[PDB]
Amino acid sequence: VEFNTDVLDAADKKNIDFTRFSEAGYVLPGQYLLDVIVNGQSISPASLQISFVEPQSSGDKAEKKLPQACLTSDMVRLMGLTAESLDKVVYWHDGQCADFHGLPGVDIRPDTGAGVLRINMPQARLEYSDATWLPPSRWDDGIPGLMLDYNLNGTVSRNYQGGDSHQFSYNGTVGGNLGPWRLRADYQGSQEQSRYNGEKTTNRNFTWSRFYLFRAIPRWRANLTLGENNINSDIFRSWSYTGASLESDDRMLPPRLRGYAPQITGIAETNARVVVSQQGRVLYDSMVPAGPFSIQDLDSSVRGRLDVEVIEQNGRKKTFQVDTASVPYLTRPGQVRYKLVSGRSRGYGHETEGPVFATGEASWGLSNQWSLYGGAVLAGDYNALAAGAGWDLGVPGTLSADITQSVARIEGERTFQGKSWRLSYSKRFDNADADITFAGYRFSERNYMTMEQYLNARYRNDYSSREKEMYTVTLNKNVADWNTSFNLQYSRQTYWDIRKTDYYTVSVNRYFNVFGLQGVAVGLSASRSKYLGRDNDSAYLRISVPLGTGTASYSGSMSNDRYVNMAGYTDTFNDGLDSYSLNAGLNSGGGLTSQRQINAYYSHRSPLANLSANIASLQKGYTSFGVSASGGATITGKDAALHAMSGGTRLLVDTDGVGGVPVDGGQVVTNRWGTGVVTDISSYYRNTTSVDLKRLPDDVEATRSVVESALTEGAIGYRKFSVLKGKRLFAILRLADGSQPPFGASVTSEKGRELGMVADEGLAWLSGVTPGETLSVNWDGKIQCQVNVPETAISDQQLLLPCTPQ
Amino acid sequence: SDVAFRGNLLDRPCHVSGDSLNKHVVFKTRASRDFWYPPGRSPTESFVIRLENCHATAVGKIVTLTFKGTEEAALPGHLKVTGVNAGRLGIALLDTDGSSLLKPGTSHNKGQGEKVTGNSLELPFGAYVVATPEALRTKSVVPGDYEATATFELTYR
Amino acid sequence: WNNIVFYSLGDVNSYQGGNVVITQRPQFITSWRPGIATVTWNQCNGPGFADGFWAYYREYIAWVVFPKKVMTQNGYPLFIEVHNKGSWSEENTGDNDSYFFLKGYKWDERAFDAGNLCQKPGETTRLTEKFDDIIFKVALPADLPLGDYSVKIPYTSGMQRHFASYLGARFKIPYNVAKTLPRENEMLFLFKNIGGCRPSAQSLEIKHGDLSINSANNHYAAQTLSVSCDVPANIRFMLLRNTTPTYSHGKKFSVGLGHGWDSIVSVNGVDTGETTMRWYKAGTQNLTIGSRLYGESSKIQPGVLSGSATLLMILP
Amino acid sequence: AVSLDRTRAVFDGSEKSMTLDISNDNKQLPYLAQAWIENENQEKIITGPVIATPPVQRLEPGAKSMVRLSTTPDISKLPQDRESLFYFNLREIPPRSEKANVLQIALQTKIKLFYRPAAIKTRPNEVWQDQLILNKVSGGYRIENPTPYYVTVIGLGGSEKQAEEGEFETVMLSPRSEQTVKSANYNTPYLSYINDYGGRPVLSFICNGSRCSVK
C-alpha cells in the first residue's frame, strides 16, 4: 503493498488508478516499444510490436501471477531458433501469454524504463548469427523487374584538315531477373558521322555482345551458369565457349570456418582446461583432448597480449608469451573446390559454333597442409589430363607442381602426345623483407597443342608460336629508412627456333618531404628488352606533390628517343566529393616534330545520373569538347527510379511523398513519386540504412530511421518506412453524470497503442491522435468509456469531450 | 578522412548526503501521562542533517531551508497529526539555536547555527509534540498511533 | 621492278567505358576503319607514270599494328591483353612491344591501270571497304591510386600497295622501316577510379553527454568503426593533429578539447597513434576507437568541450 | 537520497524538447516520485508551456529514471525578445513503514528553469556579463541591466577576501530592468557570481565612481 494515497497536490480525492498503476508497475499489461536483446546482441534495432496482456491460462485461488511478453510469430521466427529441434513456440497463439514451461535455465527481465528486453540463454537451444555468418533464411527477393544502366558519351571534334563533329558511344547492360534466375544482356554500339567539304559519310553499328542468365544455390554453395563466358588462367589459358558451368562462391561461410590460425602445439600431460584472456575477458574456456591439442576454432581479431593460462586435471599451470601474429595460411584443408563446365565452343562471330566438350576441374586439400589439384578437360576430338599437388614446407617457403598429359588428334591425321611439367615457388614474410611471391618454371616441347591452339590449327590452320622452356622470379624488399621497397626484377623468354627477347626491369620508390607536407610519392622504374642486337631502354619520370585541394603533377616518359612531358594541377573541390582535372603537356617525337596538348575536365555527381564535361585540344587535333551521361534505372519493381551506376546489388529505400530526403551511403535524394535506391552496398553484410537526420528539410520530420536487412547479389530489398505525422491536442473529457473520472488512467488506442493519461480537471493532453476514430480510456482493470473524435480537428486545440459507455 | 570530434558538456552534482537515510525518529511517550496532565508535552527529539558539497564558503546563499505541511487549525505554529489523534496534538519544531518556535512556512534566519564541517553542512535541530488545548483540558486524547510527516522545501538560490 | 607506296588513314575516334571497380575488368571495341587514306611513302624504281596495257602483278592488303606495352598519367605500364584476334592473321611471335596482324583479301590481280604510278605524299583518295571487326579486353594492374586519368592511345591504321612485273612475287615489307614512321592516327580514353578500399561510415560522429566530475575523472567512452575491402594487401593509416595540447605527455596522442582538457585517445586499448595490419583474404573487421576522459591535472576547470581530430587511411 | 545533476535548467528555442536523467542514491529501498512546474506567481500550472510527460515512475535501489519535456504553442505566442523563467518542483514518495510515531522526512527541492528563444540565442563561448554597467548612489550601488536575459549575482568585495567571504544577499533581476541595491563603496569590486556552467567567474571591475565596467 500500500502506497501513500493522501500525499499528493490535488484538490480531488479520487485516486483509484494512482495506487493501481504504481502497484501495477511490475509488468504493465499495455502496449509499448521494447528492444529484444538475446545473449547480448539484438535481432531487431527498431522492434515496434511488443505486446503485454494479463495471462488467464493458469487458474488459481488468488490469480496473482506475473504477465509476460505476448509475442507474435514473426519476431520469434526472425530470431533464428531451431524450430525443428524444440517445438515449444510453434503451437503458441497470439491470444495468450507465451509460457516457458517446457525449457529450463532461461530468465526474462522486461524493463520498459530502459527500453530493452534482456534474454539470457545457452547456445545449445539455438543457432548462431552476427553481422558475419547470416542464417540460411531467404531475404527480400520479390518483383525484380528490369535493370538498365547506360554509359554514353557525345562529343565534337576537328582535325588539321578541316572539321567534322559527330561522335557517339553507345553501351549498356540491360536484362530482367526472374526470382532467383537473373538475366543481363550487354549491348554494344556506336554512332559515327563525318562532314568534310567534298564528302559526307557516316556509319552505324550495333551488335549483341554478351547475353547471360544465372542462379545461385545456398545448399551446395555453387553458382550455376548458362551461356557464353571465359575461364580465368589457372593452368590453361583463357578461351571463349558457349554452354553450362558450375563454379565457385565462398561468400556464405564464416571466417572462423574459412580461415584457420595455427595453434599451440604444447603437449604437457592430459585433457586440460584452457583459459585465454585479452583485456580481462575469457574468449575461450573449454576441455582440450588428452596429450596433444590444436585449437583451430579461434581465428578472431587480436591486437595485443593474450595470456594463455592452462588449468590441468591435477592443477598444474604454465604461462608463456604467444605473439599476436598467429600466421594463417592460404591453403584450405577439408574444403574442396570445383569447376564443372560443358557445352560448345564460341569463335569470333556471334553465331560461331564448334565441337562439344565435357570438362572437370577440381582441387582437394588433405589436412597435413598439403593440397592436390586435378583437371580433366574432355572434348569430342581433344583430350588433356592434368594432375598436381602443392604444399607449404614452412621455413624454406612453399612449392607446387603439376603435369599435363595432352593428346591431340587433328582432322588432318596428326596425333600429338605430350606430358608437360610446370613448377611454382614462393616465399614467406622474412626478417629483412625477403619476399619471392612467385617463381615459375614451365617445361615444354615442340609437340604441343592447347585448346585455343587446337581450335585455331583445326580451322584457321596456323602452325606457329611454339615455346621451349623458361624461368621467372618475383623478389621485393623494403628497408626501414627512406620508405623504399626495392623490387629489382628479371624475366626471360625464348621460343622454338625464334629468338629470346629477354627482359630487364628495375624499380625504386622514394618517399619524403622537403619544404612541404609529407605525402610526396616518387616511384621510379626503368626497363630494358634485350634482343641479340637491340636493347630498348625505357624509363618513366614524375613530380607529384599534393596540398589537398591542389596537386602539382608532372609526367616524364621516354620509350625510345621520344621524351614526353606533362604539367598539371589536378584535384577535388572543397566538399571533397566534387572534382576536376586540369593538365598541360609537351610531346617530342623522334621524327623532328614537337607536339603540345592541353586538356581540361570537370565532373558532377548528380543523384539521378552522373554527368561530366571535357575539353581536349592538342597540336594537329583540335577542339575535342565532350559531355558524358552515365547512370542507372530500375523499372517494373515496386516503383520506377533513377540512380548512379551499379555493379550487381541495389537496395530500395521507400520514403513515399517526400521529394527531398537525403539518405546516407551515396547521398541519393528521392523523387516526386517518393522512392529511392542506394548503390554502394555488398552481399551478406550488416546494412544499417539511416537517413541524414540533421540534413532534413523543414517541411518533413522523421520518427525513426534505423531499419536492418542483409542483401545478396542481384536482389532488390524493399524497406517500408512507417514515418507519419502526429497531432497533439488537449481534450477535456466529461462523463455522463457531469463528474470527472479519477485521473492517472491511461488511454489505449484501437490498434493496441498506449498514448498517455488524464490530468486533474478531467483533461487529457494527447499527442498522435488520428481524426475520425473512437478512443478508449482504461481504469479499474477494464474499458470504461468511449469518445468519438471528429475529422475536423487539427493540432493544438481545446476540446470539451463527452463520455459514452461501451 | 573525416573530422574525429566529440561534443561534450557536464554539470555540478549538487546534492544532499546519503548518511541521513535512517531518519525515522519516533515518539515513544504516553498519551495519558504526558498529554492528559496540564504539562502538555513530549520529550524532544534531536536530528542533524548533512549535505555534501564541493565548496562551502557560503551556506544559505546556495540552498535556503523552509518547511511546511498540514498546519493545525486550533494551534498556530504547530502541525496537524494523523492517526487516532485527529487534531488533538501539535508538533512544535525548534530551530538550530533551539529558541524560536517559528511558523510552518516562514524561513530560518541564516548566518547562525550552520555547522560548516568541511564540505558537509551539518544542521542539528529539536522537535517535540505539544498538546492542543481543546483536548488537553478535556483529556480526549486517544492513546495510540499518530503518524506525522512534514515537507521541507529546500529551495536552491 | 617493284615499286611500293603506302596509304595511311586520317581517322580520329572517341570511346568511353565509364566507371569500373578495380576488382572488375573492362572490355573494348577496336573498330575497323574504312576511312580516307593519305600517302606517306614515295618510292619508284620501274616506270614513273602508270600506263596499264600489259597485265602486270598487283595485290592489296590492310595494315593495323599496335604496341604491346604503353604508359599512363603516372607512368604505369599498361599491359594490353589480347582477347580475340578476329578472322585475321597474327604473325611475328618474336616481338614484345608491337602486334603484327595482316589481311590478304586482294591478290594476284593483273593490272590495266593508267595515270601515275609514283606520286607525291600530299594526296587523298576515297575508298570504301568494310571488313571483319575486332573486340578486345584489358588485364589492368592491381595497385592504382584514386582520381581521374586520361589514357592516350598510340596507334596506326592503314596498309600498302604493290606493282611488280610478274605473277608469283611474294614480296615482304620489313617492320623496322614500318615502325620508324611518324604517328598521326587517334588517341582517346578517359577514366576515373572508383576504388576497392572504402570504409563503412565516412561521416565520423562520436558523441557523449552530461555527467558528474568524479565519475568523469579517468572515465572512458567508446565508439566503433568498421572498414571493408576485398583485395589482400597491407593497409595502414595516419592520425593527424588538429588541435593542440596544453601539457606534455610524450607518446600519448592527447587531443586538446579546450579549457585545459587534453583527452588521451584509445586505439583499441593503447595510445599508439597508428598501426599496421595485413589482409590475406577478403572481408571486413571492426575497430572500436574510444578515449580516456582525463584531460586536466587536478586543477579542474571544466566546460563545454568539442575538440577535433582527423584520421585518414594511406594506401600501400 | 536522490541525485540531482542540474544546477540550472536552460532550454533553447531551436530544440522542442530536452532530456534529463535522475538516479537513486539509496541502495536499501526503492522509491517513487512526482513532479510539477510552477511560475512567477507560484501556482501549479498543470496547463503550462512545457509539459513533462512521465508524472510518476518507480525507482529501483541505485537505478535511474528518465523524463521527457514536451512543448506547446504558448511559448510561440509569448514574446521572444526576453527569456521565460519558471519553477519546476520535485517531490519523492517513500514506502510507508508500519512502526508507531514515525517521523519520516519529506524532501522538496526547487531548481530554476530557463527558456531562451532562438532570436536571442547564445554562442557556446559568448559572455554578455561584461556588458553590464554599474552605477553608484550614495549609500548603495544601483544596477543597470541592458541585456535581454536574467542576471544573478551573489558576491561583491574590494578584494577577494571580502568577495566570497563577505556577506551579500542574493539579488536577481529581469530583462531590461533597473533597481538600486544597498552596498558599501569599494575601489575594485570583485563581482563573484555563478555562471551558466556553475563555476565562479570573479569579474574584477574597472570602475569610475558611479560607472563600473570591464575593459
Numbering used by the authors:
A (entry chain C): 1 to 644, 647 to 808
B (entry chain K): 22 to 178
C (entry chain G): 21 to 336
D (entry chain D): 1 to 215
What text appears in the publication on this structure?
Using cryo-electron microscopy (EM), we determined structures of the activated PapC usher in the process of secreting two- and three-subunit P pilus assembly intermediates.
To generate a two-subunit intermediate, we replaced the PapK NTE with the NTE from PapF (PapKF-NTE) and deleted papE and papF, resulting in a ∆EF P pilus tip fiber composed only of PapK bound to PapG. In the Conformer III ∆EF structure, PapC CTD2 undergoes another dramatic shift, moving 28 Å toward the N-terminal end of the first lobe of PapD, next to where the usher NTD is bound, forming a PapC NTD–PapD–PapC CTD2 interface. The usher’s other periplasmic domains also undergo conformational changes in Conformer III compared to Conformer II. The PapC NTD moves significantly away from the plug domain, shifting laterally by ~21 Å. In Conformer III, CTD2 also makes direct contact with the N-terminal tail region of the NTD: CTD2 residues P744, F745, and W781 interact with NTD residues L8 and I16 in a hydrophobic network. (5) CTD2 then shifts toward the N-terminal end of the first lobe of PapD, forming an NTD–chaperone-CTD2 interface, which is accompanied by a counter movement of the NTD and bound chaperone–subunit complex toward the CTDs (Conformer III).
